Ligand binder design. Structure first.
Ligand SMILES: C[NH+](C)c1cc(NC(=O)CNC(C)(C)C)c(O)c2c1C[C@H]1C[C@H]3[C@H]([NH+](C)C)C(O)=C(C(N)=O)C(=O)[C@@]3(O)C(O)=C1C2=O
Ligand SMILES: [Mg+2]
Ligand SMILES: [Mg+2]
Ligand SMILES: [Mg+2]
Ligand SMILES: [Mg+2]
Ligand SMILES: [Mg+2]
Ligand SMILES: [Mg+2]
Ligand SMILES: [Mg+2]
Lengths: 304, 192, 132, 584, 101, 67, 122, 105, 37
RNA sequence: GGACCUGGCGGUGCUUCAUAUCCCUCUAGAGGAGCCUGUUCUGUAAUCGAUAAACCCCGAUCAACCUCACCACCUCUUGCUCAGCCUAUAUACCGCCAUCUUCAGCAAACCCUGAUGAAGGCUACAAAGUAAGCGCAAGUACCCACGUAAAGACGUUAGGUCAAGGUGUAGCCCAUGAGGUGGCAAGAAAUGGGCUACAUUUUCUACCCCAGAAACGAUAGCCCUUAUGAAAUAAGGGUCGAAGGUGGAUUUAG
C-alpha cells in the first residue's frame, strides 16, 4: 500500500534525523539504540510499555494487511478461494496428499502462531484437526521433505535447568575458606558466612545461638540443614540479621546456611537438599487490609 | 495549511539551533513521527500531529548530547579549578576544619518562600580544634546532648533567626562563645 | 457501577479521544496527567492554591477560547514559567487567534504574577481515537 | 515571535505585519482593561515585588488644589487638567513654585496643548507595496508631513510664560524647543534673541532646535542659512556649551535637505567631528550617505565615499546613540543596490554579522527592503549555487520576499539555464502566497515552456501548470477580473502537449474558444504533432477550424499538412476546402 | 458572589480573627503562665470575655476551597472528598494514582 | 530561597538579644521573670521580625504601666 | 563573554548533593544521564544514588451519601534520585547549578541541593 | 460563583434528562459595547465605544433575529397523508438506497 | 477571596471577551421565566 | 375464546458440580454480663437524609460555641451577589455509586429459516450463520507467571443523595430570604455493631518468653489534677471492688 510505502520512507528519513539528532551521523543506527534514544528524548513514565513511545519500522508498527485475492477480471488466484479459508484448507490438502503418497509408497505450533503464519482467523477445532493431521504424519514413517515440513511447523521449547547456583568458595581472611550467603523471609534479612571447619559454631549478631534464640523451635530451625546433610559438628557460621521476628529471623538464617552449605556440599546432596526444600525462598508474606473489611481476607458481620 | 518543516528540513542540521528552550512537543517542528498511546486491537499507536499525551510528556528534545557538548563549550569560561587539597578527607579536614550546613529548597510557582530552607547546622572536629583538655571536658559538659562517642563531631543547629547569613552568624558565634566559656575557668569546678 | 470518567457506549457512533476514552484506573498506567505542578509532591506547602489556580485557568481558557479548544489543556508549571499548551481547532481567523493569545498571555501574567506562555497547536478536526 | 503551527504561519510580509499588529493590539487590550479595573489585580503573589507587573494608576489621587497635585498631574501627563488647576491655583492666590511651573510648561511645549494620543503610535507606514518604484519626490512631499500640532498663537504655554514672574534659562529653552517642534521657527528665533537680550544660556537641544528652525525658515539662500549655522555655533562656543553627536547630526540632516551644494560642508562637518573627538555614529554616516546619494547625479564619487565610509567602518561593534542607524543600514545598502557592487554588499553583510548590527537592522519594513535588495543583487551577479544557498539561508528565516524578487529569481535562473529548480521555487512561492501574482505566473510559464525538456521535467511542469490553471479557475468574482493571458494559455498548452496531457490540451483549446485569445503558431504545430501521434483527423480538423475562426495566416499550411498526413473523407475535405475559401 | 452564606460567614471569621489575633495571643499567654496574681489574671479574664466571639479560632471550620462542605475535606488541597475524586479521576491533578498494592 | 527579604539589616542580635528593648526593671521581680520568658519566646521566633518583636514588648510595657 | 575576576578567594563547596525527587522514574534517570554527561565533560566527579521511593496512600469514600464499605484508595508515588557531588568550585557550583535548575523538568521535579562549604575557624 | 459554574453540555444533559443554543453570538459582543479592533470591527488601530442608540439598535436586531430563529424552528412541515393522517400506509419513502455494486434504483 | 474571581469574570463576560455557558443558560431560562411566569 | 412465540417462575426431571458455600465436617466469635456507639420508641420549643439482602461507628477520615440547615427571642430591607432559598419533586435530572458481579454476556451492519407471524439460527467424521465495538480475557500495581488488588459491559431494583454542588418544574420576597444571643443531643424500654471480661494456656512484677508471687472483672460512678479551648471532651492519678460462673433457638467469618 502507498500508506506503507510513504510510512517506510518517513521512518527511514526519521531514523536518519534521529541518529543525527543524538550523536550518530554514521549510517548504522540499530534498533536498541533507537529505543534508548527515544527513551531519553521522551521520558516515558507510563506503566504500559505499549503506551511508552515507540520507533519501529511500519512493518512492525502496522498489522499484516492481506493482499487482494482477485484481479481486475474477478478470477481469484487460489483455487480454494470460495472456502474463505484458503491458506488453512490448502495446508490441509497438502498434508493429506503427503500422507496419501507416503502411504502408497510404503513443541507444537499454537493456534495464534498458526493464525499469524496463515493471516486467517482460525477455529480451535480446526487447529486441533491440523495438529492431529501432523501427528498422523509424524507417526507415519516419513521422508525428509515431510520432516522439514513438520519442523517448520514445530517451534522451540526453551527448557530451563534447575541445578542450584553454587556460590564460589572464597579463600580469604587469614587462611580459611568460606561462603557468604543471603536469606530473606517475612521482612527479615539475614546474611551469613560459613567457614568449612570449626566443629559447629554460630555467631548470630555477635552473640551465640543459645543467646539470640532462647526458643528450642528456633534452635531446631538452625539445626535442620546440618542434621539433614549429616555435617552437624563440622562448620561455623557468623551471621548478621535485620528486621522481622524470632521465627522469620530463624527461617532467613536457615535459608542463608542452606544456600551456603550448597557450596560446601556435593552436587547430588545439594539436589537432594533442594528436594528437601531448603534452597527456596518462602514467598508467604503478610497480605494487605482492604477498605470495607476487617483484615486481609476476614470480612465484617451479616451479609447474607 | 502549509507543507510542514518536518519534511522541509533535511539531514546535517543543528538541533541546538532548532530547539533552544525547553518547549512542549510541537510535532510540526519535530522531524520525528512519534506515536503515542495504547493502540486499538487491530490498529497502531496513534499518530504524531495531534497528541495531547506527547504534549504532556516533559519533552527532553532541547537537550541532545551535542547540545550539551557545544553549550558547555560556551560555559567552560565560568569556572576555576581546585587547589591540591587532595581527595583525602583527613587532608581536607586538616586544611579546612569546620563544616557548615546551609541548603536551599527549590519550589516551582509564584513564590520562593520555603522557610525551612534557612536551617543551618555546624559540625566541627575536636581533633582538628586541637586546643581543649579540661576545656574539652567543660565543653562536653556544656553540650551533653550532642557529640556522639563514636566520632568526634560537634553538631550545633540553628533555626532561630529568619535569614540564612545570620543563621551562619549564630553558628560561628556559638562556636566562638562555647570555646571562650569552655576556656573560662569557673570557681566551682573543683567541687565536682 | 463505576461512573467516574468513563464515557459509555451508545451504539458505535460517538467520536471520542484518548483522554476521555481512557478511564481513571489508567490514570498514569496509560494516560498521564494534564497538569504538571510540583505542589502535590510530598514536601510542598502551596498545592491547594495550585489546584484552585488550575481549575480557574481551565475554566478561563474554555470560556475565552469559545468552541475551538479540541480537548482539554496541557497546564505545565516549571519554576515561574507557567505554560498553557492548547490543541485549538482551525476554524476561526488567525488574527483572532493571535489577539486572544496576547490577551490571555498578559491577563494571566497580571493575574498569576508570573511569566505565562501560550503555546498553541492548530488541528483541522477533532481527533477520533475510537467510536463508542 | 510567531507561533510554530503551519496554519498560524504568516505567508507574506503583510500577513506577518498584520499578525504582529494583532498581537500588539491584544497587548494594549489588556493594558486598557487592567488599568480600567486595577482592583482585581492588586493581590500580588510574586516575590520580589514587581512594579511593572503592578497596574498603573492614571487618575489623580490628590484632589485638593495643591502643588503636589500639580506634580502628580504633570507626571500623569494630563495637560488640560494641569492647566485648569493651575488656573485654580492662580485664582486661589497660592504662589506656584518655579520648578513646577517649569514642568508644566515642559508638558505644554512637549504636547502642544493637547493630550497624549491614546493609541501608541505605530501608524503612518501603511503604504501599499505596489508603488515602491515611482515618484520618490512626490512621495517625499506627501509622506514628510506628519499631521502634528502647529504652534497656535496665544496658547496655554504662552499664557503661562507671560503669567510667570521670573523667567529663566530652563523656561526659555523649553519654549524655543517647543516652538521648533511645533514649527514656530521665526517665533523661536525671536525668543532666542529675547534670551540673548535677557542674558541667559541656551543648552544643546535648544541650540539644535535653533539650527533646525533656521534651516526650516522660508525664503533664504543655503549660503545665508549656512552663515547662520556658523553664527549659531559661534554663539554656542561663546556661551561655552559643548556641541555633540546629536548637534552635528541635526546639522547633517539639514544639509541633507540642502542637497548638492552641501557635500563639501558635510565633509568639513565630519572632519570637525574627528578633530573635536566625538565618535561619528551610524546615523551620521546615514545622513552623509543620503546626502551624497541623489537621483540624477552622473559622477558617483559621491557613491565612492561609501567605500571610504566602510574603509573607516569595518570590524567595529556599535551601541545605540541616534535613532537613524536602521536607516543607516537601509540607506547604505540602498547604495549597494544602486551601484551593483557585490563585494561592497558582502562587506555590508559582514559588518552586519559582526556583533549586534543585526539589532541595528531595526524595523520589519527596513529589514524587508534590506534583504530584498540583497537577494536581488545576489541573483543579479552571483552564481546559482551560492544564490540558492543564500535562498535557503535567508528565506523564509530572515524575511518574506516580494513579487519583484520572484521575477528576479526567474531572470537569474533563466540566465543560469538551471531550469530544474523551477518547480521547487514555484512551490515555495505558492506556500508564501504568490499564487495570485499574474506577473509571476506569466514569467514562470514563458520560462517554463520556452524550451524542450527531459520528460521528468516535462511532467513536473505539467503538474505545476495544472495547479496554475487550477488557481486561475479558482479565482472567482474579484474586481481585478483578470482575463486569461494568451501567452499563459499558450505556455500551459505547450507544456501539457510536451508532457503528453493531450486531452487537457484539447479542453483548454475549448478554453481558448471561450476567452477568444489568439493561439500561437508553435502551439498549433505541436497540436498537429499530437494529432499525428494520436491519428485523429477529427482533432486535426478541429484545430484547423480554430485557426480558420481566428483567420490566422498559417491555416492554409495546416490544411495542406492535414491532407498530406491524414486519410480524409470527402465531406471533411469539402469542409476544409470551404474553410480555405473563406480565409482566402 | 460566594458559594454560600456559610462560607461567607467563615471567611468573615478568617479575616476578623486574623486581625484580632495578636492581643488574644498576648493575654492567652497571660492566662497560661503561672507567675501573676489571680486577680491580676481575673481582670484579663473579663477583657478576653469581652473580646468578640467570632475571632476566637475555635469557630474556624476548614471547609472546602471549592464548594462549602464541612466534613469530608482533605487539608492538603482543601478539597472535599468527591470534588477531589472529580479532579483526580479526570487527571487534571498530577501524581495521584489509584492505589493498587 | 531569599530573593529580597532583607529585614533592614537586623544581623543576628536584634532578633534574639533583647536587653536593649528589655529596659531592665528590678530584675528580681515576677514582671522581670515574665519578661525573660517573653524575650526567650521572641528569640525563638523566626517568623516575626524585630519590629513586631519590640512592638509586642512595648505593648506589654504599656499594659503593665497601665496596671 | 564577561568574566569579572573580582576580589575574594573561593567559598569551597565540598559535597554539593542534589536530591532530584519526582513522580516519574524515566524523567529522573533521563535527568540523571543529562547531568552525569554534563559533569563528565565539565570534569567534576558526579556520583549516583537511589534512595527508596515513598508512596503516600490514603482512602476516600466512593459514593456521595452512603456505602462506606466501597472506597477509592489514592496514592502518590514519590521517587528519589540522589546525585551526590564532591570536589567542585564555588563559581563552578554557580554555573553548574545554574544550568541544572534552568533545565529542571516540569512538575515532575524537585531538587534539594545540599551545599557543604568548608571555611576556616574563627 | 464562577468556580461552581459548569458547562452547558452538562447543564442541558441534566435539564433534558433524556438518559433516564449559543451559535447566535459573535466573539466580541458584550452589552457595554466596548468594541475592540481585534474583535467585531476589523484591525483602523483605534479603540472606541459605541453609543446608546447603536447599542440598543444592535441588541434589537439580535433579538429580532432570535424570534426569526424561533419561527424557523416552529414552521409547519407538510407530510402527505397515507390512507389517513397519523398513519403509515401510504407514506412514500424515497427511492431505494443505491446498491454497493454500482447500482441505482 | 472570590470577589476578584467572580466580579472579574462578570465584567469580562459583559465585555464580551468571555463566554460563560452557565450564565448564558440561566439568562435564557430567566428570559423565558419573565416571559411566562 | 382457540393455537402459539419469548421471558420469568416451578415445595420441576436427568446429569455434573459448588468447598468457606450446599451438607457432614475445621477454628474463632455473636446472641447471655458491663461499657462505647448508631437506630426504634417515649420525651423536648427543638434539623434532615439511609432504613431486606444493597440501613443500623450510615452522610460524619466525627456536633461545648462554631459546625447548624433545628427551636426561642429580637432586629435587616435592593439583602456578600445584576439577590437568594438546606423550599417540594432522587417518580425530571446531571453528578458519584450500591446490587446481580464470589456473572459472561451485550451487540451496530448483514444473511438465512419460519407459505416473508411473534420469533429463531445448534451438530469439526459439521445441518446457516458472518461479525465491527463494549465486557470477561489480555495487558498493568504490589513480592513472581501465584495470590491479592484494581477491572467487570447492556440492563435490574422509578435502588441512594434537589442536603456536596449544579439544576428543570412549581413557590417566596415582608420571607419560606438575612443577621445577632441563648438552648436542643434525656431514658419506664428495645435492638444492630464493636470493646472488655467471666480467669489457671489466668493475674501482678522484672525480663521482653528457663524467675518470683497470687489463686478473678468497669475504657462504668464520685473526687483531684492536667491538656485544649473564651467558656470541660480527652488524659493521668485517687476512690470504688458492680453485675458477672463462657451464653438456648438461631447465626457470622475464615
Ligand atoms: C408509593 N410508591 C408507589 C412509590 C412512589 C414514589 N413516587 C411517587 O409516586 C411520588 N411522586 C410525586 C411525589 C407526586 C412527584 C416513589 O418514588 C417510590 C415508591 C415506592 C417506594 C418504596 C420504597 C421502600 N422503602 C423506602 C421503605 C422500599 O422498601 C423499597 C424496596 N424495594 O426496598 C422501594 O422500592 C422504595 O425504596 C422506593 O424506591 C420507593 C419509591 O421510589
Ligand atoms: Mg389527523
Ligand atoms: Mg428519601
Ligand atoms: Mg430555612
Ligand atoms: Mg459496588
Ligand atoms: Mg474489588
Ligand atoms: Mg481484567
Ligand atoms: Mg422504588
Amino acid at each position: 500500500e502507498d500508506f506503507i510505502k510513504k510510512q517506510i520512507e518517513e521512518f527511514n528519513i526519521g531514523k536518519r534525523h534521529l541518529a543525527n539528532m543524538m550523536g550518530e551521523d554514521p549510517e548504522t543506527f540499530t534498533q536498541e539504540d533507537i529505543d534508548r534514544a527515544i527513551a531519553y528524548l521522551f521520558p516515558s513514565g507510563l506503566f504500559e510499555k505499549r503506551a511508552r513511545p515507540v520507533m519501529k519500522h511500519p512493518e512492525q508498527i502496522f498489522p499484516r494487511q492481506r493482499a487482494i485475492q482477485w484481479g481486475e477480471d474477478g478470477r481469484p488466484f487460489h483455487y480454494l478461494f470460495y472456502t474463505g479459508k484458503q491458506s488453512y484448507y490448502s495446508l490441509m490438502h497438502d498434508v493429506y496428499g503427503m500422507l496419501l503418497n507416503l502411504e502408497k509408497h510404503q513443541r507444537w505450533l499454537i493456534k495464534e502462531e498458526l493464525e499469524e503464519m496463515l493471516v486467517e482467523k482460525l477455529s480451535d477445532l480446526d487447529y486441533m484437526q491440523f495438529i492431529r493431521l501432523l501427528e498422523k504424519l509424524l507417526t507415519s514413517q516419513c521422508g525428509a521433505a515431510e520432516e522439514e515440513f513438520v519442523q517448520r511447523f514445530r517451534r522451540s521449547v526453551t527448557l530451563e535447568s534447575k541445578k542450584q547456583l553454587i556460590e564460589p568458595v572464597q579463600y580469604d581472611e587469614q587462611g580459611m575458606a568460606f561462603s557468604k550467603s543471603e536469606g530473606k523471609r517475612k521482612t527479615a534479612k539475614a546474611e551469613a558466612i560459613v567457614y568449612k571447619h570449626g566443629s559447629g559454631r554460630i555467631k548470630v549478631n555477635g552473640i551465640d545461638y543459645q543467646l539470640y534464640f532462647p526458643i528450642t523451635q528456633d534452635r531446631e530451625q538452625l539445626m535442620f540443614p546440618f542434621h539433614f546433610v549429616d555435617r552437624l559438628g563440622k562448620h561455623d557460621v557468623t551471621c548478621t540479621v535485620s528486621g522481622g521476628g524470632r521465627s522469620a529471623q530463624a527461617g532467613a538464617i536457615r535459608l542463608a546456611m542452606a544456600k551456603a552449605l550448597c557450596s560446601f556440599v556435593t552436587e547430588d546432596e545439594v539436589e537432594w537438599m533442594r528436594q528437601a526444600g531448603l534452597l527456596t525462598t518462602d514467598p508467604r508474606v503478610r497480605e494487605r487490609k482492604k477498605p470495607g473489611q476487617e483484615g486481609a481476607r476476614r470480612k465484617f458481620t451479616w451479609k447474607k | 495549511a502549509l507543507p510542514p518543516r518536518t519534511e522541509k528540513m533535511a539531514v546535517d542540521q543543528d538541533w541546538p539551533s532548532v530547539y533552544p528552550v525547553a518547549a512542549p512537543f510541537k510535532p510540526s517542528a519535530v522531524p520525528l513521527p512519534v506515536r503515542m498511546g495504547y493502540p486499538v486491537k487491530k490498529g497502531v499507536p496513534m499518530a504524531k500531529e495531534g497528541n495531547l499525551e506527547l504534549l504532556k510528556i516533559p519533552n527532553f528534545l532541547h537537550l541532545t548530547p551535542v547540545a550539551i557538548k557545544k553549550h558547555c563549550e560556551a560555559l567552560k569560561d565560568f569556572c576555576t579549578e581546585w587547589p591540591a587539597a587532595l581527595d583525602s578527607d583527613e587532608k581536607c579536614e586538616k586544611h579546612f576544619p569546620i563544616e557548615i550546613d546551609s541548603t536551599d529548597y527549590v519550589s516551582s510557582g509564584p513564590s520562593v518562600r520555603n522557610p525551612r530552607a534557612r536551617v543551618v547546622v555546624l559540625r566541627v572536629k575536636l581533633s582538628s580544634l586541637n586546643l581543649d583538655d579540661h576545656a574539652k571536658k567543660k565543653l562536653i559538659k556544656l553540650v551533653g546532648e550532642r557529640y556522639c562517642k563514636t566520632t568526634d563531631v560537634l553538631t550545633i543547629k540553628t533555626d532561630r533567626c529568619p535569614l540564612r547569613r545570620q543563621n551562619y552568624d549564630y553558628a560561628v558565634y556559638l562556636l566562638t562563645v562555647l570555646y571562650h566559656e569552655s576556656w573560662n575557668t569557673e570557681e566551682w569546678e573543683k567541687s565536682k | 457501577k463505576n461512573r467516574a470518567a468513563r464515557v459509555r457506549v451508545s451504539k458505535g457512533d460517538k467520536p471520542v479521544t484518548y483522554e476521555e476514552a481512557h478511564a481513571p484506573h489508567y490514570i498514569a498506567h496509560r494516560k498521564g496527567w494534564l497538569s504538571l505542578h510540583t505542589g502535590n509532591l510530598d514536601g510542598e506547602d502551596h498545592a491547594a492554591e495550585r489546584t484552585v489556580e488550575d481549575v480557574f485557568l481551565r475554566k478561563f481558557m474554555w470560556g475565552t477560547f469559545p468552541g475551538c479548544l479540541a480537548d482539554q489543556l496541557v497546564l505545565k508549571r516549571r519554576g515561574n514559567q507557567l505554560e498553557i499548551c492548547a490543541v485549538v481547532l482551525r476554524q476561526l481567523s488567525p488574527h483572532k487567534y493571535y489577539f486572544l493569545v496576547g490577551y490571555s498571555e498578559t491577563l494571566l501574567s497580571y493575574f498569576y504574577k508570573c511569566p505565562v506562555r501560550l503555546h498553541l497547536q492548530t488541528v483541522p478536526s477533532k481527533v477520533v481515537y475510537k467510536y463508542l | 515571535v510567531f507561533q510554530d503551527d503551519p496554519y498560524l504561519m504568516p505567508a507574506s510580509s503583510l500577513e506577518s505585519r498584520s499578525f504582529l499588529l494583532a498581537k500588539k493590539s491584544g497587548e494594549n487590550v489588556a493594558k486598557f482593561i487592567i488599568n480600567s479595573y486595577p482592583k482585581y489585580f492588586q493581590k500580588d503573589i510574586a516575590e520580589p515585588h514587581i512594579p511593572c507587573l503592578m497596574p498603573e494608576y492614571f487618575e489623580p489621587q490628590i484632589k485638593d488644589i495643591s502643588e503636589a497635585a500639580l506634580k502628580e498631574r504633570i507626571e500623569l501627563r494630563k495637560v488640560k487638567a494641569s492647566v485648569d488647576m493651575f488656573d485654580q491655583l492662580l485664582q486661589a492666590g497660592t504662589t506656584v513654585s518655579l520648578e513646577t511651573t517649569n514642568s508644566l510648561l515642559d508638558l505644554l511645549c512637549y504636547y502642544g496643548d493637547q493630550e497624549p494620543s491614546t493609541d501608541y503610535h505605530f501608524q503612518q507606514t501603511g503604504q501599499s507595496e505596489a508603488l515602491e518604484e515611482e515618484n520618490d519626490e512626490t512621495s517625499r512631499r506627501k509622506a514628510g508631513h506628519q499631521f502634528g500640532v502647529t504652534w497656535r498663537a496665544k496658547n496655554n504655554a504662552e499664557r503661562i510664560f507671560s503669567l510667570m514672574p521670573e523667567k529663566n534659562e530652563h523656561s526659555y529653552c523649553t519654549m524655543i524647543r517647543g516652538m521648533v517642534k511645533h514649527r514656530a521657527y521665526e517665533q523661536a528665533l525671536n525668543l532666542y534673541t529675547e534670551l540673548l537680550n535677557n542674558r541667559l544660556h541656551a543648552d544643546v537641544y535648544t541650540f539644535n532646535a535653533l539650527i533646525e528652525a533656521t534651516v526650516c525658515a522660508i525664503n533664504e539662500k543655503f549660503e545665508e542659512k549656512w552663515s547662520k549655522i556658523l553664527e549659531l555655533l559661534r554663539h554656542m562656543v561663546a556661551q561655552k556649551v559643548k556641541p555633540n553627536l546629536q548637534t552635528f547630526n541635526t546639522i547633517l540632516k539639514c544639509l541633507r535637505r540642502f542637497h548638492v551644494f552641501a557635500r563639501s560642508p558635510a565633509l568639513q562637518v565630519l572632519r570637525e567631528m574627528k578633530a573635536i573627538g566625538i565618535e561619528p555614529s551610524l546615523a551620521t554616516y546615514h545622513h552623509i550617505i543620503r546626502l551624497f546619494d541623489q537621483p540624477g547625479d552622473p559622477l558617483k564619487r559621491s557613491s565612492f565615499i561609501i567605500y571610504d565610509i566602510m574603509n573607516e567602518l569595518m570590524g567595529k561593534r556599535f551601541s545605540p546613540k541616534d535613532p537613524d542607524d536602521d536607516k543607516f543600514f537601509q540607506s547604505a545598502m540602498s547604495i549597494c543596490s544602486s551601484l551593483r557592487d557585490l563585494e561592497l554588499a558582502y562587506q555590508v553583510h559582514g559588518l552586519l554579522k559582526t556583533g549586534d548590527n543585526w539589532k541595528f537592522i531595526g524595523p520589519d519594513q527596513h529589514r524587508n527592503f534590506y534583504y530584498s535588495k540583497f537577494f536581488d543583487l545576489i541573483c543579479l551577479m552571483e552564481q546559482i549555487d551560492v544564490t540558492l544557498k543564500w535562498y535557503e539561508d535567508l528565506i523564509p528565516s530572515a524575511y518574506f520576499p516580494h513579487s519583484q524578487t520572484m521575477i528576479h529569481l526567474l531572470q537569474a535562473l533563466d540566465v543560469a539555464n538551471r531550469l530544474e529548480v523551477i518547480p521547487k521555487i514555484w512551490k515555495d512561492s505558492k506556500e508564501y502566497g504568490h499564487t495570485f501574482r499574474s506577473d509571476l505566473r506569466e514569467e514562470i510559464l514563458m520560462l517554463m515552456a520556452r524550451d524542450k525538456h527531459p520528460p521528468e521535467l516535462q511532467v513536473a511542469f505539467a503538474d505545476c501548470a495544472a495547479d496554475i490553471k487550477s488557481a486561475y479557475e479558482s479565482q472567482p468574482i474579484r474586481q481585478t477580473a483578470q482575463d486569461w493571458p494568451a501567452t499563459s494559455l499558450n505556455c500551459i498548452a505547450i507544456l501539457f502537449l510536451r508532457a503528453g496531457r493531450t486531452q487537457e490540451a484539447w479542453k483548454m483549446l475549448g478554453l481558448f474558444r471561450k476567452h477568444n485569445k489568439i493561439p500561437r503558431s508553435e502551439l498549433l504545430n505541436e497540436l498537429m504533432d499530437s494529432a499525428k501521434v494520436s491519428n485523429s483527423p477529427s482533432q486535426a480538423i478541429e484545430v484547423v477550424e480554430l485557426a480558420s475562426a481566428f483567420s490566422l495566416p498559417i491555416c492554409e499550411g495546416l490544411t495542406q499538412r492535414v491532407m498530406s498526413d491524414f486519410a480524409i473523407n470527402q465531406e471533411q475535405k469539402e469542409a476544409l476546402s470551404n474553410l480555405t475559401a473563406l480565409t482566402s | 458572589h460566594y458559594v454560600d452564606w456559610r462560607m461567607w460567614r467563615d471567611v468573615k471569621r478568617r479575616k476578623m480573627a486574623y486581625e484580632y489575633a495578636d492581643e488574644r495571643l498576648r493575654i492567652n499567654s497571660l492566662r497560661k503562665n503561672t507567675i501573676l496574681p489571680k486577680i491580676l489574671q481575673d481582670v484579663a479574664d473579663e477583657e478576653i470575655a469581652a473580646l468578640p466571639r467570632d475571632s476566637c479560632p475555635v469557630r474556624i471550620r476548614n471547609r472546602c476551597v471549592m464548594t462549602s462542605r464541612p466534613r469530608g475535606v482533605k487539608r492538603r488541597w482543601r478539597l472535599s472528598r468527591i470534588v477531589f475524586r472529580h479532579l483526580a479521576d479526570h487527571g487534571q491533578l498530577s501524581g495521584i494514582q489509584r492505589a493498587t498494592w | 530561597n531569599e530573593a529580597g527579604f532583607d529585614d533592614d539589616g537586623s544581623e543576628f542580635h536584634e532578633h534574639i538579644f533583647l536587653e536593649k528593648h528589655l529596659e531592665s526593671f528590678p530584675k528580681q521581680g515576677p514582671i522581670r521573670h515574665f519578661m525573660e520568658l517573653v524575650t526567650c519566646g521572641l528569640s525563638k521566633n523566626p517568623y516575626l521580625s524585630v519590629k513586631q518583636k519590640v512592638e509586642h514588648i512595648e505593648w506589654f510595657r504599656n499594659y503593665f504601666n497601665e496596671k | 563573554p564577561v568574566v569579572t575576576i573580582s576580589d575574594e578567594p573561593d567559598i569551597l563547596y565540598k559535597r554539593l548533593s542534589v536530591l532530584v525527587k519526582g513522580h516519574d522514574k524515566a524523567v529522573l534517570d533521563s535527568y540523571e544521564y543529562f547531568a552525569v554527561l554534563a559533569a563528565k565533560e565539565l570534569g567534576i566527579s558526579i556520583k549516583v544514588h537511589e534512595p527508596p521511593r515513598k508512596i503516600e496512600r490514603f482512602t476516600l469514600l466512593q459514593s456521595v451519601h452512603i456505602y462506606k464499605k466501597h472506597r477509592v484508595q489514592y496514592e502518590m508515588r514519590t521517587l528519589y534520585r540522589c546525585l551526590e557531588l564532591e570536589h567542585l568550585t564555588g563559581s563552578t557550583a554557580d554555573v553548574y547549578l545554574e544550568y541544572i535548575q534552568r533545565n529542571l523538568p516540569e512538575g515532575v521535579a524537585m531538587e534539594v541541593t545540599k551545599t557543604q562549604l568548608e571555611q576556616l575557624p574563627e | 460563583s464562577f468556580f461552581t459554574k459548569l458547562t452547558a453540555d452538562e447543564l442541558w444533559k441534566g435539564a433534558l434528562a433524556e438518559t433516564g443554543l449559543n451559535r447566535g453570538q459573535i466573539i466580541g459582543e458584550g452589552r457595554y459595547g466596548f468594541l475592540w479592533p481585534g474583535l467585531n470591527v476589523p484591525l483602523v488601530q483605534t479603540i472606541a465605544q459605541r453609543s446608546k442608540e447603536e447599542q440598543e439598535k444592535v441588541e434589537a436586531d439580535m433579538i429580532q433575529q432570535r424570534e426569526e430563529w424561533d419561527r424557523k424552528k416552529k414552521m409547519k412541515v407538510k407530510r402527505e397523508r397515507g390512507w389517513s393522517g397519523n398513519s403509515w400506509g401510504g407514506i412514500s419513502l424515497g427511492p431505494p438506497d443505491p446498491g454497493p455494486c454500482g447500482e441505482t434504483y | 477571596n472570590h470577589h476578584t474571581y467572580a466580579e472579574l469574570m462578570q465584567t469580562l463576560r459583559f465585555l464580551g471577551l468571555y463566554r460563560d455557558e452557565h450564565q448564558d443558560f440561566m439568562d435564557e431560562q430567566k428570559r423565558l421565566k419573565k416571559l411566562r411566569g
